[PDB]
């Protein structure tokens, strides 16, 4: 310890880290360390440089050896926290920053970083303490005040949050800016604090007082209407909501709220004044006719003869305009299945009216006029309709009528392809979809749908070629490599599921793992906003970000990818030949076990050689990525070769279980997992949880329990 000459080099080591390009810094570390290996801080700086460029445990070893040598030094703890945060190990990083700060209490930047980690780990208790110490360090900046108030708001301590916001706002008697946007957002947040503490009554009074300060006019007026409806101030809500319709008369909730203000509708259902209820909407037709809501919204709650009258005018309205979206609009009305028949019989009559005449029904010939092209969209509606209803014979007959009339229309071929898909014929469905794409080569949408149907038909490579047209093909694995970078969820899912039924497990596991990586990224993307949001002063928005991230893994996409991975991991455990990703014909031969040992050995010899060729192929791919830094080690084969697939299945199950009550399938998979793990008490409870919901007569429940009985009685012998 303590040398004058080594100090100049020790500092250059640190400065070189800050300036990146860690090669120069390591050059300043090496001469000193070889003859003085026992310096803790020194080993650490060597480590982070070896970590910063990489890779990787080479750094950790120098870091950990240095952190053991200097107990003791905040420098070693700070750097250990750096590489941990870099490697996304947050619980370990946070514990490093608290120790780094305990050894250097005057260094505030550590706390500024610590708050980020504590916000990410959702440690609201310790977060508040940290934000508080930062506020005491620098009460000057408004951001530190908001950060403490928000942290306290998240803990549920609204009163303490109130005092903080109110204390700060009084320290500026002159103003008004400041930002004026920070002020506007702060006030809305303060109004949220009051609402959460003193109730709606006080929050309403406060909101009216801060009206001059709020720049976001929609946020104010919407919050006002919510309050005024709660306090049953209907005449005030009436006018306020009217201001909202003036700005945006396409917002459904506004009409539902205006109806509630008139008392024509309850908070849930519309009761009653059914005559004046329509009358409002008729007056809402005076709200400039550029909005479809006044005519369309009542179609949801209308019934009987008044529905038939209005749905007729509505359908004629969109048919004469030639709107291709006409079915998708009315589509939601089919929830009751009674209106479905009414709409069906109505447009079926539209079909044979245009037969002899050009006018709908019969009595429309008394009002004369005519329409030329309405048969198209009537046929197209009927084509979509019966496909939805599931006729498929009637459906396909109608698209052909539409295609025969106008062969150049893309949408007609989209529906026909769907019908072929519903008919179970995927090959011809794929061809029709590709024909639809050929009709529009500049539209990425129709291209994407085309690749999907190619995927559903298990043509993965043909699909990759198809999407190669619309992707940035510069670097990483082609179009598909770019689709992973852009977090395209649907493709990785459809591609992986395709590989799954082709028994290509390595690639299926690869695609599914990408979905995992996408969600992990989304979960991690909020990190910088634990700082940046308070700099902009978007408090109520930051709150939404925090609450969104809490349930971020509760998604159909993650569920499907996790479920699929576990299913493949089950196969890897069950079948010894699953590791080699055998072809479907080869997979069925070994799964039947009817073949002799002569043919059996032959298949394995092939499967091993083919695996080696894929492994050899993977290396050439890695050499390609490297020469072009962070590479990709698993080009897809590394996952499927796992020593214990049960562990990996267990990892995939982790973020499925918390949401298992609304998705009982997680409990079933859990039962299936621990059944194989020979852990029956933990297997049975999960099976029981899945039995409570949806269970008893459920097919997936009895098949799991049947599987459960087969293994448990196999643990013993008789």
């Amino acid at each position: 310890q303590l040398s004058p000459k080594e100090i100049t080099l020790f500092r250059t080591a640190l400065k070189c880290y800050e300036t990146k390009q860690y090669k120069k810094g390591l050059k300043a570390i090496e001469p000193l360390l070889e003859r003085h290996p026992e310096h803790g801080e020194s080993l650490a700086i060597k480590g982070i440089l070896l970590h910063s460029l990489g890779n990787t445990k080479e750094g950790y070893d120098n870091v950990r050896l240095g952190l053991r040598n200097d107990v003791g030094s905040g420098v070693c703890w700070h750097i250990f926290g750096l590489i941990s945060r870099a490697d996304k190990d947050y619980v370990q990083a946070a514990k490093c920053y608290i120790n780094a700060h305990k050894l250097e209490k005057n260094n505030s930047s550590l706390l500024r970083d610590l708050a980020l980690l504590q916000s990410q780990l959702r440690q609201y208790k310790a977060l508040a303490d940290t934000r508080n110490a930062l506020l005491q360090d620098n009460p000057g900046v408004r951001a530190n005040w908001s950060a403490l108030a928000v942290a306290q708001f998240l803990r549920g301590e609204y009163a303490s949050a109130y005092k903080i916001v109110d204390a700060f706002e009084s320290t500026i008697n002159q103003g008004v800016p400041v930002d004026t946007q920070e002020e506007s957002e702060a006030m809305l947040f303060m109004n949220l604090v009051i609402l959460k503490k003193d109730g709606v009554e006080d929050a309403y009074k406060h909101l009216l007082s801060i009206e001059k300060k709020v720049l976001d006019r929609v946020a104010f007026l919407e919050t006002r209407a919510e309050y005024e409806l709660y306090l049953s101030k209907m005449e005030e809500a009436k006018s306020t909501i009217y201001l909202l319709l003036d700005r945006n008369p396409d917002n459904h909730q506004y009409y539902y709220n205006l109806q509630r203000a008139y008392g024509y509708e309850d908070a849930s259902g519309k009761v009653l004044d059914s005559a004046e209820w329509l009358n409002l909407y008729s007056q809402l037709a005076k709200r400039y006719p550029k909005s479809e809501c006044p005519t369309r919204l009542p179609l949801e709650k209308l019934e009987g003869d008044e529905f038939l009258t209005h749905v007729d005018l509505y359908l004629r309205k969109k048919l004469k305009r030639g709107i291709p979206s006409v079915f998708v609009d009315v589509k939601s009305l089919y929830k009751d299945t009674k209106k479905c028949k009414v709409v069906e019989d109505l447009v079926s009559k539209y079909a044979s009216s245009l037969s002899t005449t050009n006018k709908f029904s019969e009595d429309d010939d008394n009002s004369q006029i005519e329409i030329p092209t309405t048969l198209l969209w009537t046929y197209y509606f009927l084509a979509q309709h019966f496909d939805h209803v599931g006729e498929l014979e009637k459906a396909e007959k109608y698209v052909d009528l539409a295609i025969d009339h106008t062969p150049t229309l893309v949408e007609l071929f989209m529906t026909k392809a769907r019908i072929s898909k519903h008919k179970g014929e995927l090959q011809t469905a794929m061809e029709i979809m590709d024909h639809a794409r050929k009709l529009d080569l500049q539209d990425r949408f129709i291209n994407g749908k085309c690749a999907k149907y190619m995927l559903r038909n298990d043509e993965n490579e043909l699909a990759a070629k198809t999407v190669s047209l619309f992707t940035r093909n510069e670097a990483v694995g082609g179009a598909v490599g770019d689709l992973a970078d852009m977090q395209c969820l649907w493709y990785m899912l459809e591609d992986g599921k395709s590989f799954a039924r082709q028994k290509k497990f390595a690639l299926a596991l690869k695609r599914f793992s990408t979905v995992f990586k996408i969600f992990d990224t989304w979960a991690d993307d909020q990190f910088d906003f634990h700082f940046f949001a308070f700099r902009k002063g978007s408090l109520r928005t930051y709150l939404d970000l925090m609450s969104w991230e809490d349930s971020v893994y509760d998604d159909p996409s993650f569920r499907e990818a996790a479920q699929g991975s576990i299913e493949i991991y089950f196969a890897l455990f069950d079948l010894p030949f699953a590791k080699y990703s055998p072809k479907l014909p080869d997979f069925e031969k070994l799964s039947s076990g009817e073949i002799n040992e002569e043919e059996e050995k032959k298949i394995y010899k092939k499967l091993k050689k083919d695996l080696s060729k894929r492994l050899e192929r993977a290396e050439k791919l890695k050499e390609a990525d490297k020469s072009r830094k962070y590479d990709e080690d698993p080009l897809g084969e590394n996952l499927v070769a796992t020593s214990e697939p049960l562990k990996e299945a267990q990892k995939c199950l982790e973020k499925l279980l918390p949401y298992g009550d609304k998705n009982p399938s997680a409990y079933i998979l859990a039962a299936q997992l621990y059944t194989r793990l020979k852990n029956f008490d933990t297997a049975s409870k999960y099976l029981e949880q899945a039995k409570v919901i949806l269970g008893q007569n459920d097919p997936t429940v009895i098949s799991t329990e049947k599987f459960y009985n087969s293994i448990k009685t196999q643990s013993n012998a008789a």
Binding site: D216, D250, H252, R296, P324, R472, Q487, Q526, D528, T541
Partner: protein, 153 residues
Amino acid sequence: MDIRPARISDLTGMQNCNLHNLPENYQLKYYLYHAISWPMLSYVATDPKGRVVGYVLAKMEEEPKDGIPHGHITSVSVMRSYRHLGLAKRLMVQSQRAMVEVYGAKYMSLHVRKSNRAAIHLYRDTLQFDVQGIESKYYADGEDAYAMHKDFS
């Protein structure tokens, strides 16, 4: 058919809608960056199931030209199914109002490839944009981009 201000929860839905009809994509953090930096500027159109159908990703220019504040449309698209409705035009007018009222934007700007007939016909004709100029090989494929400006006066 329900148009409304965009929230955090429907950001991924906007990204999906972008990955479906644009070539021309960003990762979710950049959407997050829009939500935090300019929370009321982005709008969203929604189908009966609550899923994002159309959107407008809007922002104020971080480094304003000459020092005058102005808005910028980074992305806007509608699913092929819901096109020819007025969704985009209505998404634009809501976002435009917010730019002026909250941030005091003196104008708004965007980029369109010269071959996009639907986009140009939307801005120059129905939304009253002016063509400020042409940017050579702006897009990755090398296509030129029209710089469009709508001045508020």
